[PDB]
Design an enzyme around this catalytic site. Structure first.
Site, PDB file in Angstrom:
ATOM      1  N   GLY A 168       0.687  -1.117  -0.073  1.00  0.00           N
ATOM      2  CA  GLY A 168      -0.083  -0.008   0.060  1.00  0.00           C
ATOM      3  C   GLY A 168       0.795   1.157  -0.143  1.00  0.00           C
ATOM      4  O   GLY A 168       2.058   1.232   0.108  1.00  0.00           O
ATOM      5  N   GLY A 210       1.062   5.474   1.639  1.00  0.00           N
ATOM      6  CA  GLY A 210       0.229   6.131   2.398  1.00  0.00           C
ATOM      7  C   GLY A 210       0.724   7.714   2.265  1.00  0.00           C
ATOM      8  O   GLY A 210       1.558   7.821   1.189  1.00  0.00           O
ATOM      9  N   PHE A 257       3.142   9.655   3.605  1.00  0.00           N
ATOM     10  CA  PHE A 257       4.621   9.737   3.669  1.00  0.00           C
ATOM     11  C   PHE A 257       5.388   8.638   3.069  1.00  0.00           C
ATOM     12  O   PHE A 257       6.563   8.716   2.815  1.00  0.00           O
ATOM     13  CB  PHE A 257       5.001   9.484   5.167  1.00  0.00           C
ATOM     14  CG  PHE A 257       4.129  10.758   6.098  1.00  0.00           C
ATOM     15  CD1 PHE A 257       3.099  10.264   6.781  1.00  0.00           C
ATOM     16  CD2 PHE A 257       4.884  11.893   6.471  1.00  0.00           C
ATOM     17  CE1 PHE A 257       2.568  10.907   7.744  1.00  0.00           C
ATOM     18  CE2 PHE A 257       4.303  12.761   7.195  1.00  0.00           C
ATOM     19  CZ  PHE A 257       2.969  12.394   7.957  1.00  0.00           C
ATOM     20  N   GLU A 290       0.696  -3.767  13.588  1.00  0.00           N
ATOM     21  CA  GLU A 290       0.186  -5.055  13.483  1.00  0.00           C
ATOM     22  C   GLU A 290      -0.202  -5.145  12.014  1.00  0.00           C
ATOM     23  O   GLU A 290      -0.753  -4.370  11.342  1.00  0.00           O
ATOM     24  CB  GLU A 290      -0.899  -5.380  14.446  1.00  0.00           C
ATOM     25  CG  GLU A 290      -2.274  -5.223  13.918  1.00  0.00           C
ATOM     26  CD  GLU A 290      -3.370  -4.940  15.182  1.00  0.00           C
ATOM     27  OE1 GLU A 290      -4.081  -4.284  15.436  1.00  0.00           O
ATOM     28  OE2 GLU A 290      -2.792  -5.683  16.109  1.00  0.00           O
ATOM     29  N   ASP A 299     -12.446  11.066  10.930  1.00  0.00           N
ATOM     30  CA  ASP A 299     -12.426  10.561   9.427  1.00  0.00           C
ATOM     31  C   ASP A 299     -12.761   9.071   9.408  1.00  0.00           C
ATOM     32  O   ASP A 299     -12.120   8.422   8.955  1.00  0.00           O
ATOM     33  CB  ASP A 299     -10.744  11.000   9.081  1.00  0.00           C
ATOM     34  CG  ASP A 299     -10.646  10.755   7.532  1.00  0.00           C
ATOM     35  OD1 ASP A 299      -9.612  10.732   7.343  1.00  0.00           O
ATOM     36  OD2 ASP A 299     -11.537  10.743   6.740  1.00  0.00           O
ATOM     37  N   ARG A 329     -12.613   3.630   3.773  1.00  0.00           N
ATOM     38  CA  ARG A 329     -11.221   3.753   3.236  1.00  0.00           C
ATOM     39  C   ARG A 329     -10.158   3.806   4.345  1.00  0.00           C
ATOM     40  O   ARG A 329      -8.948   3.381   4.272  1.00  0.00           O
ATOM     41  CB  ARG A 329     -10.933   4.919   2.353  1.00  0.00           C
ATOM     42  CG  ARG A 329     -10.712   6.319   3.196  1.00  0.00           C
ATOM     43  CD  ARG A 329     -10.735   7.699   2.375  1.00  0.00           C
ATOM     44  NE  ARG A 329     -10.831   8.791   3.362  1.00  0.00           N
ATOM     45  CZ  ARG A 329     -11.925   9.363   3.556  1.00  0.00           C
ATOM     46  NH1 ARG A 329     -13.043   9.457   3.128  1.00  0.00           N
ATOM     47  NH2 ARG A 329     -11.888  10.630   4.496  1.00  0.00           N
ATOM     48  N   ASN A 330     -10.486   4.126   5.701  1.00  0.00           N
ATOM     49  CA  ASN A 330      -9.775   4.158   6.779  1.00  0.00           C
ATOM     50  C   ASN A 330      -9.897   2.862   7.635  1.00  0.00           C
ATOM     51  O   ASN A 330      -9.637   3.054   8.913  1.00  0.00           O
ATOM     52  CB  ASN A 330      -9.987   5.314   7.402  1.00  0.00           C
ATOM     53  CG  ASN A 330      -9.704   6.632   6.477  1.00  0.00           C
ATOM     54  OD1 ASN A 330      -8.464   6.471   6.027  1.00  0.00           O
ATOM     55  ND2 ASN A 330     -10.282   7.640   6.620  1.00  0.00           N
ATOM     56  N   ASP A 375      -4.946   3.842  10.880  1.00  0.00           N
ATOM     57  CA  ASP A 375      -4.083   4.884  11.258  1.00  0.00           C
ATOM     58  C   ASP A 375      -3.194   4.723  12.574  1.00  0.00           C
ATOM     59  O   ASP A 375      -2.292   3.845  12.454  1.00  0.00           O
ATOM     60  CB  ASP A 375      -4.795   6.050  11.737  1.00  0.00           C
ATOM     61  CG  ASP A 375      -5.996   6.401  10.659  1.00  0.00           C
ATOM     62  OD1 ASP A 375      -7.141   6.680  11.005  1.00  0.00           O
ATOM     63  OD2 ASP A 375      -5.582   6.403   9.503  1.00  0.00           O
TER      64      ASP A 375
HETATM   65  N1  LIG Z   1      -1.340  -2.172   9.459  1.00  0.00           N
HETATM   66  C1  LIG Z   1      -1.687  -2.345   7.912  1.00  0.00           C
HETATM   67  N2  LIG Z   1      -2.034  -3.628   7.650  1.00  0.00           N
HETATM   68  C2  LIG Z   1      -2.078  -3.943   6.254  1.00  0.00           C
HETATM   69  N3  LIG Z   1      -2.220  -2.939   5.562  1.00  0.00           N
HETATM   70  C3  LIG Z   1      -1.804  -1.422   5.773  1.00  0.00           C
HETATM   71  C4  LIG Z   1      -1.608  -1.274   7.119  1.00  0.00           C
HETATM   72  N4  LIG Z   1      -1.326  -0.064   7.382  1.00  0.00           N
HETATM   73  C5  LIG Z   1      -1.266   0.635   6.131  1.00  0.00           C
HETATM   74  N5  LIG Z   1      -1.813  -0.328   5.262  1.00  0.00           N
HETATM   75  C6  LIG Z   1      -1.728  -0.167   3.672  1.00  0.00           C
HETATM   76  O1  LIG Z   1      -1.205   1.013   3.469  1.00  0.00           O
HETATM   77  C7  LIG Z   1      -2.301   2.136   2.844  1.00  0.00           C
HETATM   78  C8  LIG Z   1      -1.740   3.504   3.460  1.00  0.00           C
HETATM   79  O2  LIG Z   1      -1.409   3.389   4.796  1.00  0.00           O
HETATM   80  P1  LIG Z   1      -2.242   4.471   5.906  1.00  0.00           P
HETATM   81  O3  LIG Z   1      -2.166   4.156   7.221  1.00  0.00           O
HETATM   82  O4  LIG Z   1      -3.676   4.604   5.462  1.00  0.00           O
HETATM   83  O5  LIG Z   1      -1.439   5.744   5.618  1.00  0.00           O
HETATM   84  P2  LIG Z   1      -1.268   7.203   6.276  1.00  0.00           P
HETATM   85  O6  LIG Z   1      -0.141   7.256   7.022  1.00  0.00           O
HETATM   86  O7  LIG Z   1      -1.578   8.176   5.340  1.00  0.00           O
HETATM   87  O8  LIG Z   1      -2.390   6.979   7.465  1.00  0.00           O
HETATM   88  C9  LIG Z   1      -3.301   1.523   3.423  1.00  0.00           C
HETATM   89  O9  LIG Z   1      -4.428   2.093   2.852  1.00  0.00           O
HETATM   90  C10 LIG Z   1      -3.208   0.032   3.351  1.00  0.00           C
HETATM   91  O10 LIG Z   1      -3.347  -0.350   2.047  1.00  0.00           O
END
Ligand SMILES: Nc1ncnc2c1ncn2[C@@H]1O[C@H](COP(=O)(O)OP(=O)(O)O)[C@@H](O)[C@H]1O
Length: 252
Positions: free
Chosen positions: A16, A18, A20, A85, A131, A135-136, A149
């Site tokens: 995925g 994010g 950053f 996790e 939020d 999607r979250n 998050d």
């Molecule tokens: N703990 C996780 N387990 C599985 N996939 C994850 C996990 N954390 C992030 N992802 C993947 O990474 C993407 C972006 O991470 P996210 O936490 O939403 O980014 P941000 O730092 O912008 O909050 C998620 O939409 C998902 O696809």
């Protein structure tokens, strides 16, 4: 202390992307072999970015609930990583879309109920999420989702108009999240401009009953969309009501 020795992490494939940087799955070997997600940060060579990135870890550290993604730890030297996790099945929206014709109604309702337990926990912690949306949410297994998050289309009228954010505005957003789930990951107000949302809401219009959604459940969604925030259920009530809807559906 959440600082993790980098030699204990094996970085795997990208899962995925994010704010950053890319997110990877991997393995954390500790006192072993534990599937984890590794969040990376393209620009954490700069402290101004590093500080913001690591703020995610500081926030998640405060929570401990089975339906909220857990922080495992961090690595604060370049490349900066946050170890979380792993929710192996990934983002809920894509999950719901690929399994549109395979996930039974009981599972969809289960996901809503699990989320409500996490949200009732956050409300009890006096924490406003701001939020809530499919999607979250991440999917740990076919029977377990966890919270991860302007998102105008998910927002309560008081949030759109006056930037008021409370547990009640969260309840409104959760109502839209439940609608998303029951719609198999379709977003709300498709084809509608953000600026026109508030107008429809003020007119009394609401997202329609998803096909195959139990009326009792759609009723719960509409209660989340009471215009007056004081008239919406608290999360602990949504949890209670979703429990009964789930049990009834499991009974067939
Ligand atoms: N703990 C996780 N387990 C599985 N996939 C994850 C996990 N954390 C992030 N992802 C993947 O990474 C993407 C972006 O991470 P996210 O936490 O939403 O980014 P941000 O730092 O912008 O909050 C998620 O939409 C998902 O696809």
């Amino acid at each position: 202390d959440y600082e993790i020795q980098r030699e204990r992490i094996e970085l795997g494939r990208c899962i995925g992307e994010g704010q950053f940087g890319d997110v990877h799955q991997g393995i954390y070997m500790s006192p072993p072999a534990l599937a984890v997600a590794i969040k990376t940060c393209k620009n954490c060579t700069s402290d101004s970015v590093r500080e913001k990135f690591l703020q995610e870890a500081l926030t998640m550290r405060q929570f401990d609930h089975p339906h909220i993604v857990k922080l495992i730890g961090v690595i604060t030297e370049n490349p900066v990583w946050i170890i979380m996790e792993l929710c192996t099945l990934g983002e809920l929206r894509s999950f719901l879309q690929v399994r549109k014709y395979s996930l039974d109604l009981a599972s969809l309702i289960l996901y809503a109920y699990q989320l409500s337990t996490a949200l009732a926990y956050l409300e009890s912690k006096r924490f406003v999420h701001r939020d809530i949306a499919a999607r979250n949410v991440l999917v740990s297994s076919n029977d377990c989702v966890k919270l991860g998050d302007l998102p105008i289309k998910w927002m309560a009228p008081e949030s759109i108009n006056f930037r008021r954010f409370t547990s009640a505005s969260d309840v409104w957003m959760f109502g839209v999240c439940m609608w998303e789930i029951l719609m198999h990951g379709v977003k709300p107000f498709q084809g509608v401009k953000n600026n026109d949302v508030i107008g429809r809401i003020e007119n009394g219009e609401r997202l329609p009953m998803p096909p195959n959604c139990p009326p009792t459940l759609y009723s719960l969604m509409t209660k989340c969309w009471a215009y007056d925030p004081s008239r919406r259920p608290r999360f602990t009530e949504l949890k209670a009501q979703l429990s009964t809807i789930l049990e009834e559906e499991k009974a067939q």
